[PDB]
Scaffold this motif. Structure first.
Motif, PDB file in Angstrom:
ATOM      1  N   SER D  20       0.825  -1.202   0.000  1.00  0.00           N
ATOM      2  CA  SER D  20       0.000   0.000   0.000  1.00  0.00           C
ATOM      3  C   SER D  20       0.861   1.255   0.000  1.00  0.00           C
ATOM      4  N   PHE D  21       1.827   1.326   0.912  1.00  0.00           N
ATOM      5  CA  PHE D  21       2.654   2.522   1.009  1.00  0.00           C
ATOM      6  C   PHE D  21       3.498   2.712  -0.240  1.00  0.00           C
ATOM      7  N   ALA D  22       4.015   1.621  -0.804  1.00  0.00           N
ATOM      8  CA  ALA D  22       4.814   1.721  -2.019  1.00  0.00           C
ATOM      9  C   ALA D  22       3.974   2.194  -3.201  1.00  0.00           C
ATOM     10  N   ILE D  23       2.787   1.615  -3.382  1.00  0.00           N
ATOM     11  CA  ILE D  23       1.928   2.015  -4.493  1.00  0.00           C
ATOM     12  C   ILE D  23       1.545   3.482  -4.355  1.00  0.00           C
ATOM     13  N   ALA D  24       1.156   3.887  -3.146  1.00  0.00           N
ATOM     14  CA  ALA D  24       0.799   5.279  -2.906  1.00  0.00           C
ATOM     15  C   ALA D  24       1.995   6.200  -3.082  1.00  0.00           C
ATOM     16  N   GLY D  25       3.188   5.745  -2.705  1.00  0.00           N
ATOM     17  CA  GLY D  25       4.377   6.541  -2.946  1.00  0.00           C
ATOM     18  C   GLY D  25       4.641   6.752  -4.422  1.00  0.00           C
ATOM     19  N   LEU D  26       4.469   5.704  -5.226  1.00  0.00           N
ATOM     20  CA  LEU D  26       4.656   5.843  -6.666  1.00  0.00           C
ATOM     21  C   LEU D  26       3.643   6.809  -7.263  1.00  0.00           C
TER      22      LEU D  26
HETATM   23  C1  LIG Z   1       4.889   7.176   0.744  1.00  0.00           C
HETATM   24  C2  LIG Z   1       3.890   8.363   0.645  1.00  0.00           C
HETATM   25  C3  LIG Z   1       2.559   7.843   0.071  1.00  0.00           C
HETATM   26  C4  LIG Z   1       1.366   8.526   0.787  1.00  0.00           C
HETATM   27  C5  LIG Z   1       0.918   7.640   1.992  1.00  0.00           C
HETATM   28  C6  LIG Z   1      -0.333   8.250   2.615  1.00  0.00           C
HETATM   29  C7  LIG Z   1      -0.099   8.699   4.083  1.00  0.00           C
HETATM   30  C8  LIG Z   1      -0.803   7.716   5.066  1.00  0.00           C
HETATM   31  C9  LIG Z   1      -0.341   8.042   6.504  1.00  0.00           C
HETATM   32  C10 LIG Z   1      -0.547   6.788   7.438  1.00  0.00           C
HETATM   33  C11 LIG Z   1       0.381   6.913   8.645  1.00  0.00           C
HETATM   34  C12 LIG Z   1       0.393   5.568   9.458  1.00  0.00           C
HETATM   35  O1  LIG Z   1       1.620   5.467  10.235  1.00  0.00           O
HETATM   36  C13 LIG Z   1       1.759   4.276  10.923  1.00  0.00           C
HETATM   37  O2  LIG Z   1       1.538   4.543  12.370  1.00  0.00           O
HETATM   38  C14 LIG Z   1       1.762   3.331  13.191  1.00  0.00           C
HETATM   39  C15 LIG Z   1       1.540   3.715  14.620  1.00  0.00           C
HETATM   40  O3  LIG Z   1       1.003   2.634  15.313  1.00  0.00           O
HETATM   41  C16 LIG Z   1       3.163   2.760  13.017  1.00  0.00           C
HETATM   42  O4  LIG Z   1       3.233   1.410  13.631  1.00  0.00           O
HETATM   43  C17 LIG Z   1       3.600   1.415  14.965  1.00  0.00           C
HETATM   44  O5  LIG Z   1       2.359   1.290  15.809  1.00  0.00           O
HETATM   45  C18 LIG Z   1       1.780  -0.082  15.831  1.00  0.00           C
HETATM   46  C19 LIG Z   1       0.667  -0.129  16.802  1.00  0.00           C
HETATM   47  O6  LIG Z   1      -0.511  -0.529  16.146  1.00  0.00           O
HETATM   48  C20 LIG Z   1       2.820  -1.136  16.200  1.00  0.00           C
HETATM   49  O7  LIG Z   1       2.236  -2.437  16.099  1.00  0.00           O
HETATM   50  C21 LIG Z   1       3.998  -1.068  15.283  1.00  0.00           C
HETATM   51  O8  LIG Z   1       4.983  -2.009  15.746  1.00  0.00           O
HETATM   52  C22 LIG Z   1       4.612   0.304  15.242  1.00  0.00           C
HETATM   53  O9  LIG Z   1       5.620   0.308  14.228  1.00  0.00           O
HETATM   54  C23 LIG Z   1       3.555   2.606  11.580  1.00  0.00           C
HETATM   55  O10 LIG Z   1       5.013   2.528  11.527  1.00  0.00           O
HETATM   56  C24 LIG Z   1       3.139   3.711  10.659  1.00  0.00           C
HETATM   57  O11 LIG Z   1       3.150   3.190   9.308  1.00  0.00           O
END
Ligand SMILES: CCCCCCCCCCCCO[C@@H]1O[C@H](CO)[C@@H](O[C@H]2O[C@H](CO)[C@@H](O)[C@H](O)[C@H]2O)[C@H](O)[C@H]1O
Ligand SMILES: CCCCCCCCCCCCCCCCCC(=O)OC[C@H](COP(=O)([O-])OCC(O)COP(=O)([O-])OC[C@@H](COC(=O)CCCCCCCCCCCCCCCCC)OC(=O)CCCCCCCCCCCCCCCCC)OC(=O)CCCCCCCCCCCCCCCCC
Ligand SMILES: CCCCCCCCCCCCCCCCCC(=O)OC[C@H](COP(=O)(O)OCCN)OC(=O)CCCCCCCCCCCCCCCCC
Ligand SMILES: CCCCCCCCCCCCCCCCCC(=O)OC[C@H](COP(=O)(O)OCCN)OC(=O)CCCCCCCCCCCCCCCCC
Ligand SMILES: CCCCCCCCCCCCCCCCCC(=O)OC[C@H](COP(=O)(O)OCCN)OC(=O)CCCCCCCCCCCCCCCCC
Ligand SMILES: CCCCCCCCCCCCCCCCCC(=O)OC[C@H](COP(=O)(O)OCCN)OC(=O)CCCCCCCCCCCCCCCCC
Ligand SMILES: CCCCCCCCCCCCCCCCCC(=O)OC[C@H](COP(=O)(O)OCCN)OC(=O)CCCCCCCCCCCCCCCCC
Ligand SMILES: CCCCCCCCCCCCO[C@@H]1O[C@H](CO)[C@@H](O[C@H]2O[C@H](CO)[C@@H](O)[C@H](O)[C@H]2O)[C@H](O)[C@H]1O
Ligand SMILES: CCCCCCCCCCCCO[C@@H]1O[C@H](CO)[C@@H](O[C@H]2O[C@H](CO)[C@@H](O)[C@H](O)[C@H]2O)[C@H](O)[C@H]1O
Ligand SMILES: CCCCCCCCCCCCO[C@@H]1O[C@H](CO)[C@@H](O[C@H]2O[C@H](CO)[C@@H](O)[C@H](O)[C@H]2O)[C@H](O)[C@H]1O
Ligand SMILES: CCCCCCCCCCCCO[C@@H]1O[C@H](CO)[C@@H](O[C@H]2O[C@H](CO)[C@@H](O)[C@H](O)[C@H]2O)[C@H](O)[C@H]1O
Ligand SMILES: Nc1nc2c(ncn2[C@@H]2O[C@H](COP(=O)(O)OP(=O)(O)OP(=O)(O)O)[C@@H](O)[C@H]2O)c(=O)[nH]1
Ligand SMILES: [Mg+2]
Lengths: 174, 347, 320, 82, 97, 48, 63, 50, 52, 52
Positions: D20-26
């Motif tokens: 998901s993050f990779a596709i959205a990043g692209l």
């Molecule tokens: C690349 C750009 C593309 C656009 C992407 C769109 C933006 C979306 C923003 C979503 C942000 C979510 O961010 C996310 O937060 C959680 C917080 O729990 C983090 O995760 C962290 O918390 C959870 C608790 O549930 C733990 O199990 C986990 O070990 C810990 O790493 C993730 O590392 C991070 O991915």
């Protein structure tokens, strides 16, 4: 006549409002609003608002009103009281219908009525646009413009919806 | 509430108000009110008790009803002028609805019933936002549509608010209800002068916000919500009683304190317009407010009420609440009369 | 930084410091039950901070220079006077009990603040959860009026609800005749005037009300005088508790931040201990309150906020 | 190196979220790097929804054709060969 | 004005009166609040469509979105009220008198 | 150590003292500089 | 103070106060006319800006 | 004249008016019903809609 | 101008003197706020926090 | 607006939807474009008191 379809729909629209505004059980009050919403879409469709009309079904009826009914099943009612079994609801229901009927009877007869304000009765078709032959939906062009003109509208609307999620979680946590 | 979420919700409250004050489009004004209301409910609910839930529910219904009437006025205006510009309205029926919608939002009488109850049911810090920041958005709209406002309606709302606010406060022992009725009376002065000189509305609004923020901050510093709780302050923080005394006398409009300036400047504007009976009636009716401010000064500062033995334990611990801006606010609440001509900055 | 939301946002979270040894343990019992000794041993063996029972001068020990203040600043509450004249007309009995509850309320906040700020557990001797046993005993002997009990419950209702109960409750059950025998052995002149009926009411309050209630939400360990001497066995039992009851399981960084924001503000802790309920035993009139307060401000290092007293050697006042 | 062993962990434990993050990043980055992104604006411009109202000839318009098939005016030769 | 405006304006009034004449269920008032929004949406859409005011075509959607988010907040408060007293009756919300 | 516990303000917060004096110094420099430029621009516009 | 200093100090006071009184009366008259006629910088309530209007050829000719 | 403008007579009037203003049931239903009466008489008796 | 605190035309006017009596009063109000700050926090009112 | 940030910053937040004779997608005109255009131009810059 079919030329009065919009007026006919608007008459049903009012009766649906009297239906739930007299406030029977919210199970039936929700039903009255669903019927009004469907009729409300019909009115909007006949003015050329295809997209806007379908949003009423998709968002108002398929979204908000589903959650209203869903919440009613949980927190408000599970069984409904017999419709019109209450004097106040029936009195309000009968009061609204008679007021609506007297409004409709006179406007139809005179092709114009004066309910507080002056209203015509010739038909809604008379105010319509006469010349049209663009090769697109103008109503669709305006809504699509939200992404090229309404940058500001998108930001504040987007922000408010995100805040809605945050707020509702705070409210319900306890 | 998570401290980061609390900040974000506070900024959304502020942003909703700002949108109202910078918008030239009625839809964006309506959006601002919607956003503002959405973010204010969590801070009313933040202590999770039935009274907080009741206050938020009563607030939601009142503000939601008002926002529907505001939108109805906007659409009627659109029907009769074909535009959305935020300014005078182009239909008398739209003006009455918009005026009543904004009176409902402001809590002016006879749409006032929610203000004492909602304020009583929410924390002091939430009441501070409710009775100060939340007045900015409706007042900024009234500032722009006043040319089309019906004079009889707006002055009737003003007179009733001064009467209701004055009479309502006489029967109160709860500090949050006293502030709520004080607010209703003060909105009355702001809107009475609006048809004549909107600048004096802003002057009264700003000064009212400063004094109200001062009182709420001093109530928070001691965690006092009742008259009798406030009567213990002399045996803990004697300085605070003097500040409360001065601020209350200022809110009573007594010279030479800052709270005289808005009443004084408003009387001047209406007399210039050959309005003599109304200012005289308003000034006399405002003595009702002065009475129940004086009552608080009697129990707080000018007499020493009985104390309790356990109070001696409080002597040993310092006052650790933030009390942010209190020294500045209290000085402006009381000592600004010599600088009155500075009101032209608002012109 | 001084603890607050900013420190919390930067990582100062209770769960990052609390371990499996971050327990609040309270030791309860009747008078002369050897609970003070057992509490001292549990803390030593478990490496917990020990809190002596909060007496009249507990607040004195946490402020200023730590030394007890004259009695006028404690309200003339006297435990010795309570034994000699339990029904005195100066209302000493309830005034003492109301004062003692406030002292325990402060100590419990000090204990919770320590636990949440360092992750180290604490051992208390009685607490605000068990303080009522003395109130019930006093009432049942006719030492205090019914309205005094109503005031106590009003104050307790709006204070105890803010704090979590102990992780472990250790009750040392010493029969009244054995206690009545140990009080005489202890050779305290005033304490020797206690009656068995008063001692029996204290015991009834623990077993009737306290222990059954705490069992619903705490790990309750009971012992006799002999079984209590074996501190290692008691500490062995504590280390083998399950912890599956009580509200401590529902806590998280968010909720503990709010709890730490309360217990660190002592004036907010004591906010409701002086509600304006005009009751003769605890009500002080204006003139006496005024002049006693003036005397308090004259004590060394008490006129100004700590750190701004030149008479006790504070420096750099013109930059503080 | 620290990031490399971080990606291996998420790939093993949360492959759905990594995709998901990779596709959205692209989706956010590629439009700035693609060389065809400029043709999207050109094609959209070239589509004539409304009538092209002719100008009044004042004699000082050498770049405005007198007839659709004249050599002046915007061309779509680039679009045909696209 | 046209015929339809008579009935659409009437529907807003009916739902406003319904909202101001409470019965017992809080849900019943939330329905009247959402009925007012429905008539506002229909009234605005008709005006905007008939006048061919193209950029305003998005306005009814924005109204629907904010109102629905506003209705979600109302339902959240209803469930919290209902979790306290076991019903959504408005006569239970009288502690603050 | 008179106090049984270290006071929060036992020792001045030197950074905050530096910030406080720095802000006061900056504001006074800004004001005088602003006032001087106001005077010069006032005389240029009126030809004094 | 001598009688001439007070006497001529009084004249300076009277001149300032008299001038202020005249200006106060004019302002009331100026404000009355501006509000009634809207032909001055005061009481200038906004009207829609005409630079917001689109003057380009539209999709249809009659406008 | 004495009975009209005594300190006791003026004080009682405001005290009586205050109890009229403040003695409310706290019910949403009654407050909103009063809103309805207010809007009707605004248009019917005072023509604030004109 | 619009939404400008001091438009450009205001620079034709003479500036307020740094010895303005109103400005001295404002400075006095600031001094009073400093004392009330010390008092509410039970510091020595006159000597405490000269930097503040 | 109460605070005319839009004019002062030269940023168009919502003025584009305020009137029906403004620029529209694909130059689609409103039915009353010429009437609104004429009324706006008559009333421009003279104030609502005079314009009425
Ligand atoms: C690349 C750009 C593309 C656009 C992407 C769109 C933006 C979306 C923003 C979503 C942000 C979510 O961010 C996310 O937060 C959680 C917080 O729990 C983090 O995760 C962290 O918390 C959870 C608790 O549930 C733990 O199990 C986990 O070990 C810990 O790493 C993730 O590392 C991070 O991915
Ligand atoms: C003309 C009409 C009449 C006059 C109108 C005047 C209007 C008010 C003028 C502005 C008043 C600002 C307050 C005065 C400063 C007092 C605070 C102070 O000096 O402490 C130094 C301050 C901290 O001192 P402290 O010991 O922690 O507490 C001081 C008070 O108790 C702190 O009390 P507090 O809790 O209320 O703190 C509030 C303050 C927060 O306090 C601060 O952080 C200092 C900020 C001062 C800003 C200066 C404003 C003026 C410049 C405008 C540009 O908020 C602000 O940030 C203000 C902006 O040090 C600094 O941060 C220096 C500023 C660095 C940037
Ligand atoms: C000029 C007026 C200046 C007004 C300044 C008021 C500062 C806030 C009051 C100072 C007292 C201490 C304080 O910071 O207020 C507390 C409150 C935050 O809430 P609190 O309960 O303390 O903790 C939140 C965690 N749940 O703080 C707040 O929530 C802020 C609420 C007040 C903001 C509105 C102020 C009125 C509008 C100002 C515009 C002036 C024009
Ligand atoms: C310049 C233009 C503006 C003109 C308008 C007038 C402006 C003045 C109003 C300014 C705002 C109010 C601030 C007043 C400062 C009060 C500080 C003070 O004088 O001391 C308070 C005193 C000290 O108490 P504390 O420090 O806690 O302990 C004492 C141990 N040494 O606390 C006590 O000891 C309590 C004493 C009992 C209470 C006595 C109450 C009567 C005295 C009240 C005086 C203030 C009244 C203000 C009203 C305006 C007066 C004209
Ligand atoms: C002695 C009495 C005089 C003291 C007055 C001090 C007021 C503070 C100085 C501000 C001076 C100023 O320029 O503001 C005046 C401004 C003018 O009002 P405006 O609607 O913009 O139109 C004016 C045309 N007559 O209108 C105002 O600024 C006053 C309205 C204040 C409303 C507060 C809004 C706060 C929003 C802040 C958002 C950012 C968060 C902080
Ligand atoms: C805008 C135009 C509105 C004009 C009407 C303004 C009056 C609005 C009423 C707001 C005040 C509400 C408080 C109130 O009226 O008290 C309740 C009171 C019922 O008290 P009751 O004893 O029955 O009547 C005695 C009257 N002599 O009821 C009344 O007395 C009335
Ligand atoms: C014009 C004046 C407006 C009020 C100025 C602001 C008041 C500042 C004085 C103050 O608030 O502190 C009073 C102070 C009390 O004495 P102290 O023993 O130091 O106790 C304080 C413990 N931190 O007193 C002091 O010892 C400091 C000396 C200054 C005291 C000034 C007294 C103010 C009285 C104001 C009354 C109204 C004046 C008109
Ligand atoms: C809280 C209750 C809410 C109920 C809302 C009900 C909907 C109200 C619809 C109002 C729309 C009609 O509003 C009304 O229309 C007519 C038609 O020109 C206007 O016209 C009327 O008044 C003015 C008076 O000089 C003139 O135009 C004309 O003499 C007369 O016909 C009214 O001035 C306007 O007020
Ligand atoms: C939490 C908030 C998150 C917000 C996330 C927003 C993500 C936005 C990512 C992409 C935004 C712009 O996306 C794209 O960027 C490039 C950068 O030159 C633009 O530019 C590209 O197209 C234009 C069109 O002629 C060409 O002239 C240009 O040579 C080409 O580089 C594209 O026209 C634009 O479509
Ligand atoms: C020319 C304009 C004059 C403006 C005057 C300013 C208005 C002041 C409003 C004060 C009104 C309320 O004032 C209030 O009056 C009643 C008198 O009945 C007093 O009440 C007292 O007297 C009544 C009987 O007389 C007793 O039943 C009551 O137990 C007793 O407390 C209140 O203690 C007082 O607070
Ligand atoms: C809670 C988050 C709050 C963050 C607030 C951030 C502010 C965001 C500002 C958005 C508005 C930016 O400024 C505005 O952008 C849009 C699109 O770029 C531009 O609008 C552009 O698109 C269409 C195309 O014709 C038209 O509106 C206009 O012709 C054109 O200029 C405006 O000319 C510009 O004034
Ligand atoms: N009235 C009253 N007396 C109390 C209270 N807590 C302790 N006391 C008295 O303080 C005295 C000593 O307290 P105890 O700890 O129980 O007796 P101890 O001998 O010193 O301690 P141990 O033998 O180790 O248990 C007793 O006489 C108690 O009655 C209280 O909350 N109220
Ligand atoms: Mg002991």
């Amino acid at each position: 006549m079919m030329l009065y379809i919009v007026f006919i729909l608007s008459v049903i629209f009012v009766m649906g409002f009297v239906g739930f505004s007299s406030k029977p059980s919210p199970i039936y009050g929700g039903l009255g609003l669903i019927v009004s919403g469907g009729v409300g879409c019909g009115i909007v469709l006949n003015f050329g608002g295809s997209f806007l009309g379908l949003m009423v079904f998709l968002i108002y009826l398929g979204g908000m009103m589903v959650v209203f009914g869903y919440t009613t099943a949980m927190a408000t009612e599970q069984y409904p009281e017999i419709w019109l079994s209450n004097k106040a609801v029936l009195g309000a229901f009968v009061t609204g219908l008679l007021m609506e009927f007297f409004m409709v009877y006179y406007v139809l007869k005179d092709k114009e009525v004066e309910v507080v304000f002056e209203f015509n009765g010739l038909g809604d078709w008379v105010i319509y646009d006469t010349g049209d032959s663009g090769f697109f939906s103008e109503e669709a062009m305006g809504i699509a413009a939200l992404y090229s003109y309404g940058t500001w509208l998108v930001i504040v609307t987007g922000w408010s919806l995100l805040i809605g999620v945050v707020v509702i979680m705070e409210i319900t946590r306890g | 509430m998570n401290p980061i979420i609390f900040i974000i919700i506070l900024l959304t409250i502020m942003l909703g108000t700002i949108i109202v004050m910078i918008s030239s489009h009625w839809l964006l004004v309506w959006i601002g009110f919607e956003m503002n209301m959405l973010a204010i409910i969590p801070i009313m609910m933040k202590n999770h008790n039935p009274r907080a839930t009741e206050a938020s529910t009563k607030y939601f219904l009142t503000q939601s009803t008002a926002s529907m009437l505001l939108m109805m006025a906007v659409i009627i205006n659109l029907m009769f002028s074909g535009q959305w510009t935020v300014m005078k309205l182009f239909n008398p029926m739209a003006s009455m609805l918009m005026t009543m919608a904004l009176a409902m939002k402001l809590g002016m009488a006879p749409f006032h019933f929610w203000v004492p109850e909602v304020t009583q049911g929410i924390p002091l810090s939430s009441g501070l936002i409710l009775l100060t920041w939340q007045k900015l958005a409706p007042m900024s709209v009234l500032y722009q549509i006043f040319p089309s406002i019906n004079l009889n309606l707006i002055l009737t709302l003003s007179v009733l608010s001064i009467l209701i606010g004055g009479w309502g406060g006489l029967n109160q022992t709860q500090l949050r209800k006293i502030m709520a009725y004080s607010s209703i009376a003060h909105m009355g002065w702001m809107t009475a002068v609006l048809p004549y000189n909107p600048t004096m509305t802003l002057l009264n609004l700003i000064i009212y916000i400063i004094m109200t923020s001062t009182m709420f901050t001093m109530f928070m510093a001691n965690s006092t919500t009742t008259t009798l709780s406030l009567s213990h302050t002399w045996n803990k923080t004697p300085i605070m009683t003097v500040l409360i005394l001065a601020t209350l006398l200022s809110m009573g409009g007594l010279p030479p304190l800052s709270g005289f300036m808005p009443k004084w400047m408003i009387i001047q504007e209406m007399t210039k317009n050959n309005s003599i009976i109304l200012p005289t009636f308003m000034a006399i009716t405002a003595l009702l407010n002065l009475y129940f401010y004086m009552r608080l000064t009697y129990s707080t500062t000018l007499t020493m009420f009985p104390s309790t033995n356990n109070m001696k334990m409080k002597w040993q611990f310092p006052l650790m609440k933030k009390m942010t801006f209190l020294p500045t606010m209290v000085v402006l609440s009381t000592m600004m009369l010599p600088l009155t001509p500075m009101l032209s900055v608002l012109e | 930084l001084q603890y607050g939301p900013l420190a919390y946002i930067l990582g100062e979270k209770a769960t990052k410091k609390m371990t499996e040894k971050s327990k609040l343990i309270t030791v309860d019992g009747n008078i002369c039950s050897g609970k003070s000794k057992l509490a001292k041993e549990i803390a030593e063996k478990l490496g917990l901070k020990h809190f002596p029972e909060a007496g009249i001068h507990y607040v004195d020990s946490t402020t200023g220079d730590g030394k007890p203040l004259p009695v006028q600043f404690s309200g003339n509450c006297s435990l010795e006077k309570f034994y000699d004249d339990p029904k005195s007309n100066d209302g000493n009995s309830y005034r003492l009990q109301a004062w003692l509850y406030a002292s325990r309320l402060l100590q419990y906040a000090d204990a919770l603040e320590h636990l949440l700020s360092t992750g180290q557990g604490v051992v208390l001797e009685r607490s605000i959860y068990s303080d009522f046993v003395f109130l019930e005993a006093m009432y049942r002997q006719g030492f205090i009026r019914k309205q005094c009990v109503d005031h106590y419950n009003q104050v307790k209702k709006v204070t105890i609800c803010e704090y979590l109960p102990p992780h472990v409750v250790v009750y040392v059950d010493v029969p009244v005749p054995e206690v009545q025998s140990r009080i005489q052995k202890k050779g305290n002149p005033h304490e020797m005037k206690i009656t068995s009926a008063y001692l029996q009411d204290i015991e009834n309050a623990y077993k009737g009300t306290f222990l059954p209630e705490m069992s619903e939400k705490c790990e309750v360990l009971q012992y006799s005088a002999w079984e209590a001497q074996d501190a290692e066995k008691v500490v062995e039992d504590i280390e083998y508790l399950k912890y599956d009851k009580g509200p401590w399981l529902d806590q998280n960084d968010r909720k503990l931040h709010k709890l730490r924001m309360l217990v660190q503000d002592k004036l907010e802790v004591l906010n409701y201990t002086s509600i304006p309920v005009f009751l003769p035993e605890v009500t002080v009139g204006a003139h006496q309150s005024d002049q006693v307060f003036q005397e308090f401000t004259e004590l060394p290092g008490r006129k100004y906020r700590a750190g701004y007293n030149e008479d006790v050697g504070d420096k750099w006042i013109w930059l503080k | 190196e620290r990031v490399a062993a971080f990606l291996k962990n998420v790939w093993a434990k949360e492959p759905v979220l990594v995709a998901s993050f990779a596709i959205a990043g692209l989706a956010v980055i590629l439009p700035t790097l693609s060389p065809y992104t400029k043709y999207s604006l050109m094609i959209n411009r070239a589509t004539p929804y409304n009538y092209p109202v002719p100008l009044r000839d004042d004699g000082n318009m050498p770049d405005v054709p007198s007839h659709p098939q004249d050599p002046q005016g915007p061309s779509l030769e680039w679009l045909k060969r696209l | 004005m046209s015929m339809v405006y008579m009935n659409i304006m009437m529907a807003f009034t009916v739902s406003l009166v319904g909202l101001l004449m409470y019965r017992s269920h809080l849900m019943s008032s939330l329905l009247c609040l959402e009925g007012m929004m429905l008539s506002l949406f229909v009234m605005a859409a008709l005006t905007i469509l008939n006048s061919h005011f193209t950029l305003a075509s998005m306005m009814p959607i924005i109204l629907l979105v904010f109102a629905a988010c506003e209705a979600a907040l109302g339902l959240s408060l209803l469930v919290m009220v209902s979790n306290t007293y076991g019903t959504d009756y408005v006569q239970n919300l009288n502690l603050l008198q | 150590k008179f106090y049984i516990q270290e006071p929060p303000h036992g020792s001045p917060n030197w950074l905050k003292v530096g910030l406080t004096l720095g802000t006061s110094v900056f504001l006074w420099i800004y004001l005088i500089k602003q006032h001087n430029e106001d005077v010069l621009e006032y005389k240029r516009r009126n030809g004094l | 103070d001598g009688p001439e200093k007070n006497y001529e100090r009084t004249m300076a006071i009277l001149q300032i106060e008299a001038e202020k009184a005249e200006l106060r009366l004019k302002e009331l008259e100026v404000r009355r006319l501006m509000r009634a006629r809207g032909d001055g910088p005061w009481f200038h309530y906004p009207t829609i800006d005409k630079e917001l209007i689109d003057h380009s050829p539209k999709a249809t000719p009659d406008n | 004249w004495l009975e009209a403008i005594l300190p006791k007579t003026i004080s009682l009037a405001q005290m009586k008016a205050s109890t009229l203003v403040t003695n409310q049931k706290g019910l949403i239903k009654l407050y909103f019903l009063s809103f309805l009466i207010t809007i009707l008489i605004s248009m019917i008796l005072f023509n604030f809609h004109e | 101008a619009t939404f400008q605190f001091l438009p450009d035309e205001a620079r034709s006017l003479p500036p307020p003197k740094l010895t303005d009596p109103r400005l001295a009063f404002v400075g006095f109000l600031g001094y009073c706020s400093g004392l009330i700050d010390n008092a509410i926090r039970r510091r020595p009112v006159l000597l405490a926090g000269l930097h503040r | 607006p109460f605070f005319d940030v839009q004019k002062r910053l030269g940023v168009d937040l919502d003025r584009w939807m305020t009137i029906q004779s403004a620029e529209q997608p694909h130059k689609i005109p409103s039915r009353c474009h010429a009437f609104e255009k004429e009324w706006i131009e008559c009333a421009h810059g003279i104030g609502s008191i005079r314009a009425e």
